[PDB]
Design a protein around this motif. Sequence first.
Motif, short mmCIF file in Angstrom:
data_model
loop_
_atom_site.label_atom_id
_atom_site.label_comp_id
_atom_site.label_asym_id
_atom_site.label_seq_id
_atom_site.Cartn_x
_atom_site.Cartn_y
_atom_site.Cartn_z
N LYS F 63 70.75 -54.66 -14.10
CA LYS F 63 70.93 -56.16 -14.02
C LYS F 63 69.52 -56.70 -14.59
O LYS F 63 69.70 -57.84 -15.20
N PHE F 64 68.43 -55.83 -14.41
CA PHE F 64 67.01 -56.31 -14.65
C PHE F 64 66.68 -55.86 -16.35
O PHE F 64 65.78 -56.54 -16.77
N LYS F 65 67.50 -55.22 -16.97
CA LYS F 65 67.16 -54.80 -18.22
C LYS F 65 67.34 -56.00 -19.16
O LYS F 65 68.09 -56.77 -19.24
N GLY F 66 66.11 -55.84 -19.99
CA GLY F 66 65.77 -56.94 -20.96
C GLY F 66 65.06 -58.39 -20.39
O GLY F 66 64.40 -58.80 -21.19
N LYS F 67 64.89 -58.53 -19.03
CA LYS F 67 64.38 -59.52 -18.30
C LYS F 67 63.08 -59.05 -17.86
O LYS F 67 62.44 -59.93 -17.31
N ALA F 68 62.64 -57.76 -17.82
CA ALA F 68 61.74 -57.16 -17.39
C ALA F 68 60.91 -56.26 -18.46
O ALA F 68 61.59 -55.64 -19.09
N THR F 69 59.58 -56.22 -18.38
CA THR F 69 58.88 -55.52 -19.23
C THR F 69 57.67 -54.76 -18.52
O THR F 69 56.87 -55.63 -17.82
N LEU F 70 57.44 -53.67 -18.52
CA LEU F 70 56.24 -52.91 -17.85
C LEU F 70 55.43 -52.28 -18.88
O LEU F 70 55.81 -51.70 -19.49
N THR F 71 54.18 -52.44 -18.42
CA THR F 71 52.90 -51.79 -19.16
C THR F 71 51.95 -51.46 -18.08
O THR F 71 51.62 -52.03 -17.41
N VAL F 72 51.26 -50.38 -18.61
CA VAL F 72 50.13 -49.80 -17.95
C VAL F 72 48.58 -49.55 -18.55
O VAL F 72 48.66 -49.65 -20.08
N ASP F 73 47.55 -49.92 -18.04
CA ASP F 73 46.17 -49.69 -18.82
C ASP F 73 45.24 -48.58 -18.09
O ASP F 73 45.04 -48.75 -16.93
N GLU F 74 45.16 -47.44 -18.68
CA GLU F 74 44.79 -46.51 -18.06
C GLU F 74 43.18 -46.72 -18.11
O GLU F 74 42.26 -46.09 -17.50
N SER F 75 42.35 -47.60 -18.80
CA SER F 75 41.14 -47.96 -18.72
C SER F 75 40.76 -48.64 -17.41
O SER F 75 39.97 -48.29 -16.55
N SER F 76 41.23 -49.90 -17.12
CA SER F 76 41.16 -50.75 -16.00
C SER F 76 41.95 -50.12 -14.80
O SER F 76 41.80 -50.46 -13.50
N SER F 77 42.65 -48.93 -15.06
CA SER F 77 43.76 -48.27 -14.02
C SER F 77 44.49 -49.55 -13.33
O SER F 77 44.59 -49.46 -12.09
N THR F 78 45.24 -50.03 -14.05
CA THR F 78 46.05 -51.15 -13.52
C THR F 78 47.53 -51.09 -13.92
O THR F 78 47.78 -50.53 -14.86
N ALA F 79 48.44 -51.67 -13.34
CA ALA F 79 49.80 -51.69 -13.68
C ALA F 79 50.43 -53.17 -13.77
O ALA F 79 50.04 -54.16 -12.83
N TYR F 80 51.12 -53.63 -14.94
CA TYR F 80 51.32 -54.72 -15.22
C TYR F 80 52.78 -54.80 -15.38
O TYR F 80 53.41 -53.91 -15.75
N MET F 81 53.36 -56.31 -14.70
CA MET F 81 54.95 -56.33 -14.89
C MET F 81 55.17 -57.61 -15.67
O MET F 81 54.83 -58.51 -15.10
N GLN F 82 55.87 -57.62 -16.81
CA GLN F 82 56.09 -58.86 -17.60
C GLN F 82 57.48 -59.27 -17.30
O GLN F 82 58.41 -58.62 -17.41
N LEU F 83 57.73 -60.55 -16.95
CA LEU F 83 59.02 -61.17 -16.68
C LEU F 83 59.17 -62.39 -17.88
O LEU F 83 57.94 -63.10 -17.91
N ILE F 84 60.28 -62.65 -18.18
CA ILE F 84 60.67 -63.72 -19.27
C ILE F 84 61.97 -64.21 -18.88
O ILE F 84 62.71 -63.71 -18.17
N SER F 85 62.10 -65.68 -19.13
CA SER F 85 63.14 -66.39 -19.16
C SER F 85 63.33 -66.60 -17.39
O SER F 85 64.46 -66.18 -16.98
N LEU F 86 62.35 -66.89 -16.62
CA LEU F 86 62.50 -66.82 -15.33
C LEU F 86 63.36 -68.35 -15.07
O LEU F 86 63.04 -69.49 -15.42
N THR F 87 64.44 -68.01 -14.29
CA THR F 87 65.55 -68.98 -13.81
C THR F 87 64.98 -69.19 -12.29
O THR F 87 64.21 -68.48 -11.57
N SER F 88 66.10 -69.99 -11.70
CA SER F 88 66.02 -70.04 -10.29
C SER F 88 66.51 -69.04 -9.53
O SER F 88 66.36 -68.87 -8.44
N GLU F 89 67.09 -68.18 -10.22
CA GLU F 89 67.76 -66.87 -9.56
C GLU F 89 66.93 -65.84 -8.93
O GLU F 89 67.13 -65.44 -7.93
N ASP F 90 65.71 -65.99 -9.47
CA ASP F 90 64.76 -64.78 -9.14
C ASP F 90 63.30 -65.67 -8.09
O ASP F 90 62.70 -66.57 -8.58
N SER F 91 63.71 -65.42 -6.93
CA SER F 91 62.67 -65.70 -5.74
C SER F 91 62.53 -64.32 -4.82
O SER F 91 63.69 -64.05 -4.28
#
Lengths: 232, 28, 255, 109, 228, 119
Positions: F63-91
């Motif tokens: 369902k979420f394929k293509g609408k979400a993107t995940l990336t991490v950074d080993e330097s700052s030791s953080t996890a990021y979640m990228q979302l595109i084309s946000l509609t009223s569907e996502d809350s």
Amino acid sequence: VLQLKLGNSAIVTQEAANYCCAYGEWPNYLPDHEAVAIDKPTQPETATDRFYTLKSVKWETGSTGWWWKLPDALNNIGMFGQNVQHHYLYRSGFLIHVQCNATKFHQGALLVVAIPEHQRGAHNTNTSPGFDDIMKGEEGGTFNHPYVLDDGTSLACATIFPHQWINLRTNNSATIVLPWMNAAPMDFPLRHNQWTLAIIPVVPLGTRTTSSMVPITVSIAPMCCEFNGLRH
Amino acid sequence: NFYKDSYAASASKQDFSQDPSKFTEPVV
Amino acid sequence: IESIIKTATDTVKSELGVVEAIQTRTVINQHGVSETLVENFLSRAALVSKRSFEYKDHTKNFFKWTINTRSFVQLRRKLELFTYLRFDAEITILTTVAVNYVGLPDLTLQAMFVPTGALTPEKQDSFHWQSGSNASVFFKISDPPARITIPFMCINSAYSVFYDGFAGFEKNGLYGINPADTIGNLCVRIVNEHQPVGFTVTVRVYMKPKHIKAWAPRPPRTLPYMSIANANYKGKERAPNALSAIIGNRDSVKT
Amino acid sequence: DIQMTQSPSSLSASLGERVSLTCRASQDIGSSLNWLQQEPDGTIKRLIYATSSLDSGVPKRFSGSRSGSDYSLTISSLESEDFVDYYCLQYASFPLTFGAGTKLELKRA
Amino acid sequence: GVPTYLLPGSGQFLTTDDHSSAPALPCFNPTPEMHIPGQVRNMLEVVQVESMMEINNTESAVGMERLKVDISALTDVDQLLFNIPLDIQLDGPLRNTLVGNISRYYTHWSGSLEMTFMFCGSFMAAGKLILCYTPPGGSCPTTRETAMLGTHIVWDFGLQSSVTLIIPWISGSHYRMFNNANVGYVTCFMQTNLIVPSESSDTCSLIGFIAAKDDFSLRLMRDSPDIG
Amino acid sequence: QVQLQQPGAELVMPGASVKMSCKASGYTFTDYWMHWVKQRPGQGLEWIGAIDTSDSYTTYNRKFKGKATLTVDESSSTAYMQLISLTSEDSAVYYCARGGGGNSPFAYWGQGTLVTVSA
């Protein structure tokens, strides 16, 4: 220079003596004594014998490798992709020609290996991979840890499988012929993957400049195809 | 083997046949 | 070229300048290769199941184990050297009774084999133990251990150790599981009724495969096994058997 | 995809009453399953992992067992803080899935 | 009937015994045998296949680059590159291979090995090497002037792209037993400097291979220590 | 000793993009997996996706394929979640978990964010 023409298409190839027949056998049609289904298999003459050229992957210095499960890349392509979902069973061989074109100023080595019955694995987790993680389709996949072959085995021992060496000195192309490897005489296209085609850059790319791109072309010819369970 | 089934007999170790050619030299 | 080789081949003596390797001599090698055969290599009696049920006073009390070679890890890496295998299973059940001086009575045990596809309403006293279709064997505690031969039961020609695909046609079968291959369950209980004694019965089940036929040899697995259901790898922190270093570390290349 | 069916979706019980929530999987997931406690404040906390074993720091009143076709979460005695949203999770195979959820109610008039 | 008396050792269960036993399923027809490519009837066919030696493993070697030996253009003349111990049981470059992994299931091992080297550098790379094999108890030479007195070959990159090195079998006993010293060594020096053009990378690589000859034999099976 | 930090509200108009943040400490971040779970107001939990902290490889839901993107950074030791084309569907309330070699568990969770989009 010598061109290999099979079917309605063809590709110019570099001459390589003593190509690789997998486990020293040439794929042939299903013999009568090994047959199971009593129906009549449909045999494509020139239809499934044409060369199917996948998308050329960009091979850089930091590229770990690529793997294409058969017949997953061929699930939908051409007319053969039709017979994938248009028939209940199949048996076929494959003639794989991998040609990496580069000048005399590039250095590196490529290990092209065909892994029968390749069971993948995920790093540092006990969860089995999903359906999309296994079956890529025409796109293919990239090794996360090619040194262990992602299955936990050793790459140094991977030479037990049928393989050819692509070195930028001697030969820039490779030809591998894969017969039918299965426990059952016929199998299901969308479920089980008999072989796997893995291209591993044992020695990485190098040059004077930092950015260098050497393309790789992969061609697959489904020789000796059969099909049963006609539907739709 | 005094039984009526051939698969229940003792293990046959007498087959020495080999074909190293299909591995070291997988060429035609 | 397929040829009969009884022993390792001999060596022809060697013999200015060329346009092979070194100077050899004539040697007749009588060393036998018979012990390196796949039959001699894979066939050995090993313990694939070890369980001891707690029995003191009951006033559950049996075991059934679907046979898979992945439980004994020394046999797992042993059988992962090959892809497809064809063999006949030879099962031997050994019964030993411990003490938790009374003396050891002689119990009667029943080892019943249930093939795949037979519904089991599992209970100790339920009627599925008395079914005539299921092959059973009766053996006492003091005697030569009970030994039976299981034939080759499969839909295909050989087992699949490494199965790339999915189970059934519902597009969700837990990757790495072959639907075609399941042999069955091995059900063993004590035939005698409940006797309020504190003795513990320990049953050992050994399996020696015979008539072994192998195909497609595979590289060994250097990394440890995380789970028995799939091929996932982790690796030890320090070498050996790691992701970064499988082979041990040394001082320098010129050392 | 393998689906986890959590039932019942809701129940009404008082203190000191043993309740159980049974989840059924389409494909056999082995011994790998997790139970998650969702507090009304928005914080989710694990309870049961890998059947028998329990989290350290969680009281022993929580328990679980496997019928062999099914998984059940057995609570000895309910407490005021034991009313939450329970979720049975399968980490055996990708993609990971969640249960339908169960909300506990109290008998009143 | 026939009078019979029991011999000592009757009724015992031996693990290595071979006898026929009662079949559990009488009158059962197994699935017919179909021809599957690549049948292995002996384990020696697997050993004879070449495999990668890892020569680069000392420290700070992670995964892939361990399979190759880096050679730059700035390396000097007559410098020792690497030495490869021939010990299978201990950990050399040879610990995990096709010959090494199969031999750890056994004890007495006798046979001749083989080495192939391959230069993965560019096409215009010039220069020569020397590969000096050291017999057992060799007391490896310091410089190449002592090692050139033995069995070696001067191998040019340009002319030939590969090396065939046969290690002869020399021992007093018919077999050698694995452990729970100084079987031999293979050393490589720099004959001349590495010559590369201006459009090619300065570095290079070498991949060692090892396989077994047709006289390689094995016996006295045991358990693999590799488990851990 | 070990915790997870994922605060914030992040209200945004539809059609825009959002990059979440999960910063984990108290352990070795490069050696463990990262996961993402959403909490909907409609009494439900869905699985966003998993990401290997090492380099790249991820797994996403259909369902979420293509609408979400995940990336991490080993330097700052953080996890990021990228979302595109946000509609009223996502809350929903997005969570980030860890896992590991054993059990690959959900044992540690974050506080979560309250995400509401309106035209």
